[PDB]
Amino acid sequence: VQLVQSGAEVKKPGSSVKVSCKASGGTFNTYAINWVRQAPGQGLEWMGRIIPMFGIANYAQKFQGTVTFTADKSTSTAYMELSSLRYEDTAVYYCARSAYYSESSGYYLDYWGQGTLVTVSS
Amino acid sequence: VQLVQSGAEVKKPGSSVKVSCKASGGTFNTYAINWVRQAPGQGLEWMGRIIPMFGIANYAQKFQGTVTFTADKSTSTAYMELSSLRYEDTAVYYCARSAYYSESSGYYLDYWGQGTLVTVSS
Amino acid sequence: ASVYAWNRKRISNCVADYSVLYNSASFSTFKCYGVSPTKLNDLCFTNVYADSFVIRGDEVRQIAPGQTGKIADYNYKLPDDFTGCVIAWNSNNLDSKVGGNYNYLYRLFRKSNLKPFERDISTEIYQAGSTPCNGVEGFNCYFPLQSYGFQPTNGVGYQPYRVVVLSFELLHAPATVCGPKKSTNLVKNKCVNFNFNGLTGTGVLTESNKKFLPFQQFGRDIADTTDAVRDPQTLEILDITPCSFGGV
Amino acid sequence: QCVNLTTRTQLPPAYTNSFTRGVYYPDKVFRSSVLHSTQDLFLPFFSNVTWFHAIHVTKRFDNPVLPFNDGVYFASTEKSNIIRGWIFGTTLDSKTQSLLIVNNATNVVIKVCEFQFCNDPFLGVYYHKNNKSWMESEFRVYSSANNCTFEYVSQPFLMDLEGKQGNFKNLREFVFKNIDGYFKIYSKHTPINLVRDLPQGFSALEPLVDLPIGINITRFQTLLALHRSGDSSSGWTAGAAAYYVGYLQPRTFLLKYNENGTITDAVDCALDPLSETKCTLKSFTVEKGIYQTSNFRVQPTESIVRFPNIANLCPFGEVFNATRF
Amino acid sequence: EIVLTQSPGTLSLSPGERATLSCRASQSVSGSYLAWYQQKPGQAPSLLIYGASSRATGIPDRFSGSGSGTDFTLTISRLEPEDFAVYYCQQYVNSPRTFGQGTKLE
Amino acid sequence: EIVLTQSPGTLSLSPGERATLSCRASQSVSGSYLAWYQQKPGQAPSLLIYGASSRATGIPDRFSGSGSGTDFTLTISRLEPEDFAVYYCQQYVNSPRTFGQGTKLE
Ligand SMILES: *[C@@H]1O[C@H](CO)[C@@H](O[C@@H]2O[C@H](CO)[C@@H](O)[C@H](O)[C@H]2NC(C)=O)[C@H](O)[C@H]1NC(C)=O
Ligand SMILES: *[C@@H]1O[C@H](CO)[C@@H](O)[C@H](O)[C@H]1NC(C)=O
Ligand SMILES: *[C@@H]1O[C@H](CO)[C@@H](O)[C@H](O)[C@H]1NC(C)=O
Ligand SMILES: *[C@@H]1O[C@H](CO)[C@@H](O)[C@H](O)[C@H]1NC(C)=O
Ligand SMILES: *[C@@H]1O[C@H](CO)[C@@H](O)[C@H](O)[C@H]1NC(C)=O
Ligand SMILES: *[C@@H]1O[C@H](CO)[C@@H](O)[C@H](O)[C@H]1NC(C)=O
């Protein structure tokens, strides 16, 4: 219901960063978490999904090898690791729900976090 | 398959009556016959069963000494005798077949007769 | 455990107590195959398997030998020659949580039917269409597992049933698992028919001064006949002598 | 999994003489002050047993292939309990049920649970130098558990695992038998004060356990622990130990039981003429005289079959090789 | 005698979807022996389900009994205007058969 | 992977009444696996329409999708002064959940 995430990362180019989307109680239980790269002034680029219960993370072809998805079953917090800050990597990283189960058959993004913007500086 | 029974008994209180449920061919052979008291505006009460082949009739505690079950092996007809018409005895007496065989284990009422209603009058 | 991750425990090298399960009768479903539930489990086994998994009430019959269903073919398959006990009971208070408890999963679909006593913990996205899944949740590709979702106010058919499948092997010669035992009080100085460890005999039992070794049950003197026997319940050694007889 | 058997010198197998050992209780029957003659699978007196010395002092780590014909006598002479376990089976490649005996640092595990074991006859104890503590750090058990029919784990305990210097001080004797679907393991412990020998004297191997397995067993293996004073294809230290392997044969033995009920002495019925005379007189003391002992007969070397006469010639060829058919 | 208590006493208010009807017994039904009876008004009952889930003839599969232990279920996929008649529970345990009170009595 | 092309690129000129916001895909969306979103400026997108025409929690009934095959409509009864947010399409037909470019970007 509430997915408060991290703020803003003063990451010098080449320096790694980890995101901190915080899932409310029962979020991880029946819902996967999705990450979408929103570079300032473009469209939404789906990075991938974290299935928290079974620890399954699958990424798109573009972002493979450049980003790492982790989630903590205890404390119910979602994390995204960026390998290094490439110049085009600056974007507001979002986090969103999904009814990944078959019976629900949702797979769409119910609720979203505020956003985490990475940049060369602030 | 067809168990046509008696119609309606104009029995003054204290006067005995005998029912005449008629078994179709082969009914008595492999099936017991059950009688169920349906007091007008109440539930079905199991009076008992008559095993025609071996002439065995066993009754519930309530109806013991007040009701007599008889069946005629020739003409394949089922009869129930009421000792006297007590005031609460007015009810639509039904007749139904039961699979009393051990191997079959069904012990269920499959088909029913139309019903015989006794009363103070008609 | 959940049905897909059916948890197996090995009951080994211990005297088994099935009477306590029979007298408690706290298990709504008490179906035993090969060995009858009517006091026939007091027997010896080389191997006792205990398996626990939580199912919905409506399909607790499916997990019986030679039966088919979703749980039977995709989660836990019982061998057609099962000679065990399928024991089930309601866990609505324990295993249903307000707003639903989603901790228990089940494999609605799988590529093939499951083999007897075989597990599958794979989370590979089930194929239902020409398009490859690629590990994404979409059209014609669905997560194999689903949540039961037991709710506190729901029908018992939609309420959890914990099932502790007991798999016996019915070998009485090898017998690691000692069976439940009857108790007969000791009687002394009387010509009694005694059955000690299957050995049947006639004679009186008296106090014995002989000291048996810990691994020895009965003793034989000269001419190869039983002389002293140690009863197993209270490790007491008793001298067997024939009761009085003679010509007239 | 497999093991790090590297830089092991090849030396011909050694055979040592076993002196009046390998005697066990034939049954669970108590007998007091009586001479009892019984026929069973036994280890012969003054026999030949195969001696393996995996001693660090190369280092001749001993882990060979050993068959299981009818029963195995296994004596372990040790000062730090290098020996760990044994593996009984037929194929070793997960396609047939096998046995596994492992006594690790805390428990004793005897499980008929099929595992991957090309050899798996090694165990690893790491000896730390910063602090004095010997603990088993490396256990090779299985790449994948294909099948499982039995599991048994003993209650947890503590063990020394330290390697003392000096002569051997402990002797663990084992007999493994498999008849009528029953696996019998008989064991005994005895203190000793020798450097290298099989101790003389008499010791009765009391029963310990009876495994209910009922599978075919025609091979057996020996698992040993190495100390570092998983490791794959790398240098090791054997650690001072020895073990003797002998095979059991169906023999008739005459045993003396004292008033205590334990086995006091035993003699064979096939070793030398005096022992067979004792067997046939059912006494350990014999008086002067001549006794009819047994019967001597020579086993026919081969069976001639000269009963057919000169062979005649059925003219099948006249039919088969005929000009016109 | 087995005290049966049909829980939905009055469901003849012309409902829709599935009207689960219940039955409960003091001691659990032995060997899942129970029956459901149509009891059409002005007529005699007909066997709907026998045992627990076994299906009787002349009746469509729109009735899917779902009971165990305290056998308790008659489930009509679509309520039918004609099929609003009271349904009776008869236990077949050794103690003398006692029908239930009924579950669709106007 | 299936792409998506939102046709009305710029409708943020303060319009009114019905709209015809569209999306089209190279291979037809299968089983109406489409999702509309509501990216308000300075904030994260909020789900608008899932499936083809289904209604989201909180969203006015006014928002609707009359799409099929190449699902292409986001009918809104009346353009609100506040509701000029860029609306985003997404397809989840066994693809890496690709999004469109947007349709109400100033
Ligand atoms: C010796 O072996 C036993 C049997 O495998 C070990 O006991 C198990 O250890 C694992 C790992 O810690 C636990 O998950 C199991 O629950 C243990 N089983 C029991 C019955 O306690 C034991 O840890 C081993 N000891 C050493 C030193 O390796
Ligand atoms: C030892 O065994 C071998 C064969 O295994 C045998 O030939 C020999 O006689 C035995 N005894 C000695 C003393 O070598
Ligand atoms: C002390 O010994 C133990 C072995 O029992 C070892 O695990 C531990 O690392 C040692 N302590 C230090 C500081 O190395
Ligand atoms: C178990 O043993 C059988 C033979 O009995 C063999 O075919 C199989 O590969 C083994 N493993 C499994 C996982 O079944
Ligand atoms: C064990 O050997 C016996 C006798 O040859 C045979 O009956 C049985 O099939 C064997 N067990 C196997 C192959 O598992
Ligand atoms: C048993 O052995 C003890 C010595 O351990 C001895 O004193 C005793 O006499 C023996 N038992 C009997 C019954 O004689």
The Cα–Cα gap between A92 and A116 comes to 5
**CA nearest D124: which of D136, D106, D109?**
D136
Q: Which CATH superfamily is domain E4-91 in?
A: Immunoglobulins (2.60.40.10)
Alpha helices, DSSP H, located in D203-286:
273-281
Q: Please indicate whether residue D216, judged by its CB atom, sits closer than 6 Å to ligand 5.
A: yes
How far apart, in whole angstroms, are the C-alpha atoms of residue D308 and residue C103? Answer: 84
What six digits make up the tokens of F93?
Answer: 């037909």
Domain boundaries, chain B: 9-119
How far apart are the C-alpha atoms of D69 and D177, rounded to whole Å?
10
Contact D16, D245 (CB under 8 A): no
Residue of C nearest to A49 (CA): C136
Q: Which helix (H) or strand (E) is D195 found in, with range?
A: none
> Could you tell me how far CA C234 lies from the centroid of its own chain?
27
Chain F residues with CB under 8 Å of A45 CB are 99
- Rounded distance between C-alpha atoms, residue A67 and residue A76, angstroms: 20
Shortest alpha-carbon distance between residue C170 and chain A (Å): 38
Strand partners, D266: D255
Of B43, B60, B106, the CB nearest to E50: B106
**How far is it, in rounded angstroms, from Cα E89 to Cα E72?**
9
CB spacing of F92 vs A107 below 8 angstroms = yes
Q: Identify whether the C-beta of residue D172 lies closer than 8 Å to the C-beta of residue D124.
A: no
What is each CA distance from B119 to B11, B18, B85, C73, C207, in whole angstroms? 6, 13, 8, 59, 81
Give the type of residue at C162. Answer: R
The CA distance from E27 to B20, in Å, is 37
Which CATH superfamily groups domain A9-119?
Immunoglobulins (2.60.40.10)
Going from the C-alpha of C13 to that of each of C172, D107, D219, the distances in angstroms are 14, 15, 25
Q: Give the C-alpha distances (Å, rounded to integers) separating C237 from A58, C186, C227, C229, F80.
A: 71, 12, 10, 6, 99
CATH number of the domain located at residue range(s) D14-296 in this protein: 2.60.120.960
Residue nearest to atom 11 of ligand 6 (CA): D260
Q: How far is the CA of D47 from the centre of ligand 2 (A)?
A: 9
How many C-beta atoms lie closer than 10 Å to residue A59's C-beta? Answer: 20
Q: Which residues of F48-65 are buried (b: 16+ CB within 10 A; e: fewer)?
A: bbbbbbeebeebeeebbb
Distance of alpha carbon C65 from the chain centroid: 15
* Cβ atoms E4, E98 nearer than 8 A: yes
Q: How many CB atoms lie within 10 A of CB C198?
A: 5
Contacts of C136 in chain F (CB under 8 A): 92, 94-97
Burial F38-47 (b: 16+ CB within 10 A, else e): bbeeeebbbb
Count of other CB atoms within 10 angstroms of residue C200: 8
Report in angstroms the alpha-carbon separations of B43 from B46, B122, C123, D48, D244.
10, 22, 54, 91, 86
The letter for the amino acid at A58 is: N
Q: By C-alpha distance, which of D260, D201, D186 is closest to D25?
A: D186
To one decimal, the resolution in angstroms is 2.4
Strands E34-37 and E47-51: antiparallel
Report whether F73 contacts F83 (CB < 8 A). no
E-chain residues near B96 (CB < 8 A): 44
- Nearest chain D alpha carbon to C171: D212
DSSP-derived secondary structure letter, C77: P
Half-sphere exposure of B107 (CA within 13 A, CB side): 16
Q: Which of D141, D62, D134, D128 is nearest to D105 (CA)?
A: D134
Whether C160 contacts C97, CB under 8 Å: no
CA neighbor of D117 nearest in space, from D228, D31, D223: D223
Query: Going along F2-65, which residue ranges are E strands?
Result: 5-6, 23-24, 36-39, 45-49
Interchain proximity E68–C155, CB inside 8 Å: no
Distance CA D202, CA A76 (A): 68
* Spatial CA neighbour of F30 closest among F2, F8, F56: F2
In order of C18, C193, D31, D41, the CA distances from C220 in angstroms are 35, 18, 6, 22
Q: What are C21's two structure tokens? A: 């399960």
Chain E positions touching B44 (Cβ under 8 A) are 37, 39, 45, 88, 90, 99
CA B92 to chain centre: 10
> Would you call C108 and A54 a contact, using CB atoms and an 8 Å cutoff?
no
Atom of ligand 6 nearest to the CA of C209: 13
- Residue D27 has phi, psi (to 5 degrees) of -150, -175
Query: Helix or strand or coil: residue D118?
Result: coil
- Which residue is it, tokens 């205890």? A74
Are residues F95 and F2 in contact, defined by beta-carbon separation less than 8 angstroms? yes
CA gap C246, C244 in Å, rounded: 7
Which residues are CB-neighbours of F79 under 8 A, at least 6 positions away?
F14, F15, F16, F17, F19
For C182, half-sphere exposure in the C-beta direction (CA atoms, 13 angstrom radius) is 8
Separation between Cα atoms, residue E63 and residue D108, nearest integer Å: 58
| Residue D107: strand, helix, or coil | coil
> Measured between CA atoms, how close is D298 to chain C, in angstroms?
35
Q: Whose CA is nearest to atom 4 of ligand 2?
A: D48
Q: Strand runs (DSSP E) across D80-142, as ranges?
A: 83-86, 88-89, 101-103, 108-110, 113-114, 122-127, 134-139
Q: Report which residue type is found at D170.
A: N
Question: Alpha helix (H) ranges present in chain C?
Answer: 19-24, 70-74, 92-95
CA dist A30 and A49 (Å) reads 14
Polymer length in residues for chain A: 122
| Best CA proximity match to B111, nearest among E43, E94, E105, E83 | E43
- Residue D21 · residue D198 · CB < 8 Å: yes
Tell whether C129 is within 8 A of chain A (Cβ).
Answer: no
The answer to whether E6 touches E78, Cβ cutoff 8 Å, is no
Distances (CA, A) of F79 to D43, F8, F103: 100, 15, 14
Please name the residue whose Cα sits nearest to atom 11 of ligand 5: D216
Phi and psi based region of residue D250 (left: phi greater than 0; alpha: psi -120 to 50; beta: remaining) = beta
Strand partners, C162: C54, C89
Chain A touched by F90 (CB under 8 Å): yes
The two tokens of residue D266 are 């035993």
* Residues in CB range of F82: below 8 A, 6 or more apart: none
Atom 15, ligand 1: which residue's CA is nearest?
D153
- Helix-then-strand count for chain D, H and E: 2, 24
Cβ-Cβ contacts under 8 Å for D302 (sequence gap 6 or more): none
The minimum-distance atom of ligand 4 relative to the CA of D147 is: 1
* DSSP H helices in chain B: 27-30
Q: Mapping DSSP to helix (H, G, I), strand (E, B) and coil, where does residue D277 land?
A: helix
Give F75's strand partners: F64
Q: Which residues pair with B80 in a beta bridge?
A: B69
Under DSSP, is residue B71 helix (H, G, I), strand (E, B) or coil? strand
Q: How many Å apart are CA F17 and CA F60, to the nearest integer? A: 15
Bridge partner residues of A21 (DSSP): A78
Task: Compute how many other C-beta atoms are within 10 angstroms of the C-beta atom of residue A74.
Answer: 5
Q: Compute the nearest-CA separation of C32 from chain E (Å).
A: 13
Q: If you count DSSP H runs as helices and E runs as strands, how many of each does chain A have, helices first?
A: 1, 10
**Both tokens assigned to D212:** 């209910």
CA–CA separation, D95 and D111 (whole Å): 16
Under DSSP, the state recorded for D197 is S
Element (H, E) at A94: strand A92-96
Residue partners of D154: CB distance under 8 A and separation at least 6: D107, D108, D109
Q: How far is the CA of D260 from the centre of ligand 6 (A)?
A: 6
Tokens of D239: 């650690």
Lookup: tokens for A72: 């903590």
Q: Tokens 């009305």 label which residue?
A: F8
Determine contact, residues C84/C33, Cβ cutoff 8 Å. Answer: yes
Rounded Cα gap, residues C165 and C50, in angstroms: 6
In the sheet with A56-59, reading across from the earlier edge strand, the strands are A8-10, A116-119, A92-96, A33-38, A45-51, A56-59
Q: In a mutagenesis test of the C interface, which of D30, D205, D262, D282 is the best target, namely the one with the most C β-carbons within 10 Å?
A: D30
In chain C, residues with a C-beta closer than 8 Å to the C-beta of F92 are: 136-139
Angle at C222 between CA C218 and CA C223, to 5 degrees: 100
- Using most ligand atoms within 8 A of CB, pick from D146, D148, D215 the residue to mutate for ligand 4: D146
DSSP letters, E3-66, are -EEES--B--S---S---B-EEESSPPGGG-EEEE---TTS---EEEEETTEEPTTS-TTB---
Torsion of CA C14, C20, C21, C22, to 10 degrees: 130
Question: Considering all CA atoms of chain F, what is the largest pairwise distance in Å, rounded to the nearest integer?
Answer: 36
**Cα(C82)–Cα(C51) distance, integer angstroms:** 13
**From F44, F50, F99, residue closest to A46, measured CB to CB:** F99
d(CA D290, CA D288): 7
Sheet architecture: strand order including E47-51: E54-55, E47-51, E34-37, E88-89
Q: Judge contact between D219 and D89, C-beta under 8 A.
A: yes
Touch between B and A (at least 3 CB pairs under 8 Å): no
Contact C131 F93 (CB under 8 A): yes
Instruction: Write down the domain spans for chain F.
Output: 4-91
- Output the DSSP codes for D136-182: EEEE---S---EES---BPPP---------SSEEEEEEEEEEEETTE
Give CA–CA dist B117/C176, Å, rounded.
68
C-beta separation of F62 from F78 below 8 A: yes
Residue E74 near residue E87, CB atoms below 8 Å: yes
CA distance A85 to A78: 20
CA distance linking residue D234 with residue B97, whole number of Å: 84
Subunits with 3+ Cβ pairs within 8 Å of E are B, C
Show which of residues 5-64 on chain E sit within 8 Å of chain B, judged by CB atoms: 33, 35, 37, 39, 43-47, 50, 56
Chain F hits for C137, Cβ within 8 Å: 92
Chains adjacent to C (≥3 CB pairs closer than 8 angstroms): A, D, E, F
Indicate which of E30, E97, E101, E104 best probes the interface with B, i.e. most B CBs within 10 Å of its own CB: E97
CA distance C79 to C92: 29
Q: How far is the CA of D53 from the centre of ligand 2 (A)?
A: 18
Which chains touch A (3+ CB pairs under 8 A)? Answer: C, F
Whether D266 contacts D25, CB under 8 Å: no
Round to the nearest angstrom and report the end-to-end CA distance of chain B. Answer: 28
DSSP for A39-77 reads -TTS--EEEEEEETTTTEEEE-TTTTTTEEEEEETTTTE
Contact: D212, C171; criterion CB under 8 Å: yes
Helix (H) or strand (E) holding B95: strand B92-98
C219 vs chain D: nearest CA distance in angstroms?
4
- Residue pointed to by tokens 């000896």: D127
Instruction: State residue F7 phi and psi, 5-degree precision.
Output: -80, -50
Query: Measuring CA to CA, how many Å separate C113 from each of C57, C82, C129, D32?
Result: 22, 18, 19, 63
What 3-state class would DSSP assign to F70? coil
D58 alpha carbon – ligand 3 mean position (Å): 29
Q: How many CB pairs under 8 A join A and C?
A: 36
Phi, psi at D276, each rounded to 5°: -70, -35
